[PDB]
Enzyme design. Structure first.
Site, PDB file in Angstrom:
ATOM      1  CB  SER A 152      70.488   5.664  84.687  1.00 52.68           C
ATOM      2  OG  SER A 152      70.722   6.469  86.018  1.00 52.68           O
ATOM      3  CG  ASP A 255      71.418  13.783  85.796  1.00 52.27           C
ATOM      4  OD1 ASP A 255      72.044  13.472  86.991  1.00 52.27           O
ATOM      5  OD2 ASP A 255      70.872  12.936  84.952  1.00 52.27           O
ATOM      6  CG  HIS A 285      68.517  10.826  86.552  1.00 48.65           C
ATOM      7  ND1 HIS A 285      69.618  10.832  85.909  1.00 48.65           N
ATOM      8  CD2 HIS A 285      67.964   9.471  86.827  1.00 48.65           C
ATOM      9  CE1 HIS A 285      69.986   9.329  85.589  1.00 48.65           C
ATOM     10  NE2 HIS A 285      68.895   8.639  86.015  1.00 48.65           N
TER      11      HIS A 285
END
Length: 307
Positions: A152, A255, A285
């Protein structure tokens, strides 16, 4: 909002973190139960930064050295730690199932330390590893075979660290980087993308929560087309190409960040970089941090990539 981030907004542009993010103590001793040995080492006391080492139990029952992974956690730049349970647990599994020593960096957080702070700490972590004479690093980790990785926001960091490290590669030796691993790297921009619009009411990462993240993270004044936000000049890819670095980018269709993750993989390829792309349908995600099965499927691919 407590519905999506465990933070309070205050009327002076700062945040409060009222909800403990659970963490796990290092466990450095082999008479412990654990399949993975951990220890924390002070990195820079002015920044209060540290590195967590993960040493898989199987390194002790041979005498060969493991590829070294420099890992950066996710959390919107604004939350989590190298010691947060979910990242600790993920990294223990990766050490066991990908056969790697891991150096997990506890970098400074936003808004207190807006970007570029955490790229800066990434570079200190590299300069500090190069220079290190830690016993686990020196006895068990192959400095010749080093990967920079992040999830991320940590994939955002890993990518910027990677660019900067490419510039000074000669200065890192004995450390030799062979690749980057970007696990759903976190990216943005002022105009919405197709996934950003399609997924706008996502139940984890809705539009406002990500606007908020970049607002707290980006230098003051900046918009979402700031280069730290939106990666896609790229003379930088020529250096990565020339050094022979492979780049793995991974993500899933569920995502919002998907189009930018995929768009960056296209740009790296289009510029001649050895890209291993892995984009799945469905999921969401950070599903790998919750799903032991999806994590395992990813370790099979990462194990491959690492050798």
């Amino acid at each position: 909002l407590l519905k999506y981030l465990p933070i309070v907004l205050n009327p002076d542009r700062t945040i409060t973190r009222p909800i403990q993010i659970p963490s796990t103590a290092a466990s450095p001793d082999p008479t412990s139960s654990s399949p993975v040995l951990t220890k924390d080492l002070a990195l820079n006391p002015l920044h209060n930064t540290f590195v967590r080492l993960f040493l898989p139990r199987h390194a002790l029952y041979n005498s060969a050295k493991l590829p070294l992974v420099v890992y950066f956690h996710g959390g919107g730049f604004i939350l989590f730690s190298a010691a947060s349970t979910i990242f600790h647990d993920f990294c223990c599994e990766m050490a066991v199932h990908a056969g790697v020593v891991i150096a997990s960096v506890d970098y400074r957080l936003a808004p207190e330390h807006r970007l570029p702070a955490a790229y800066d700490d990434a570079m200190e972590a590299l300069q500090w590893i190069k220079d290190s004479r830690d016993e686990w690093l020196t006895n068990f980790a192959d400095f010749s075979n080093c990967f920079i990785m992040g999830e991320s926001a940590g994939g955002n960091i890993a990518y910027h660290a990677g660019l900067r490290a490419a510039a000074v590669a000669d200065e890192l030796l004995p450390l030799k980087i062979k690749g980057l691993v970007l696990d759903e790297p976190g990216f943005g921009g002022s105009k919405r993308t197709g996934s950003e619009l399609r997924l706008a009411n996502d139940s984890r990462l809705p539009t406002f929560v990500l606007d908020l993240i970049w607002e707290l993270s980006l230098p003051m004044g900046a918009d979402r087309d700031h280069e730290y936000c939106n990666p896609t000049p790229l003379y930088s890819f020529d250096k990565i190409r020339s050094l022979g670095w492979r780049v793995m980018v991974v993500g899933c269709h569920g995502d919002p960040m998907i189009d930018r993750q995929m768009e960056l993989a296209e740009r790296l390829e289009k510029k001649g970089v050895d890209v291993v792309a892995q984009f799945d349908v469905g999921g969401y995600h950070a599903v790998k941090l919750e799903d032991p099965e999806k994590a395992k499927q990813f370790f099979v691919i990462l194990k491959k990539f690492v050798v």
